[PDB]
Amino acid sequence: GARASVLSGGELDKWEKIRLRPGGKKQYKLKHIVWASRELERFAVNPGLLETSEGCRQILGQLQPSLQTGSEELRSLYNTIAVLYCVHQRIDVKDTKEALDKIEEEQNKSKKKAQQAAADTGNNSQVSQNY
Numbered sequence: 001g002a003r004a005s006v007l008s009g010g011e012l013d014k015w016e017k018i019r020l021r022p023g024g025k026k027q028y029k030l031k032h033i034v035w036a037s038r039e040l041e042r043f044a045v046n047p048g049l050l051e052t053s054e055g056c057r058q059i060l061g062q063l064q065p066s067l068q069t070g071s072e073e074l075r076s077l078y079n080t081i082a083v084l085y086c087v088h089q090r091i092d093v094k095d096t097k098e099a100l101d102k103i104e105e106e107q108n109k110s111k112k113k114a115q116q117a118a119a120d121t122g123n124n125s126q127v128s129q130n131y
């Protein structure tokens with residue numbers, strides 16, 4: 001339907017620029033795109049949503065409230081989508097890391113504000129891994 005492509009010409013180039021990691025050497029490729037699509041179809045979501053910045057936003061917003069009841073399988077998607085979505089809004093984050101902060105910071109402002117005390121505190125962070 002009217003060229004079922006995720007990223008256009010100018011977008012494709014920039015896409016290849018961004019990398020999976022900030023201090024890595026592995027850049028983004030079509031694999032990372034088509035991949036998320038093959039998975040979306042499993043999450044009751046069409047891969048066509050990636051053919052529109054407006055849609056890429058709904059994806060992150062949908063899985064957002066599901067990031068709690070989901071494993072890495074959903075964590076990886078959010079990452080990729082974050083980079084792609086940015087591309088459409090004319091963004092080329094230095095890495096998949098700057099992409100998550102650019103979308104998280106917007107929400108952090110409200111968090112650190114609403115809390116500004118119960119969202120950090122001093123010493124009170126525990127952790128216990130399994131075997």
Ligand SMILES: CCCC(=O)OC[C@H](COP(=O)(O)O[C@@H]1[C@H](O)[C@H](O)[C@@H](OP(=O)(O)O)[C@H](OP(=O)(O)O)[C@H]1O)OC(=O)CCC
Nearest residue numbers: 020021024026030031032034035036072075076077079080
């Ligand atoms: C042909 C097979 C299908 C295909 O094209 O699949 C494309 C990929 C899976 O294959 P891959 O690209 O080799 O896998 C990635 C690399 O090893 C990368 O170095 C690693 O980063 P780090 O985090 O360890 O530094 C990633 O780790 P997490 O994302 O699990 O953390 C890992 O997924 O699907 C995805 O999930 C990409 C999501 C961005």
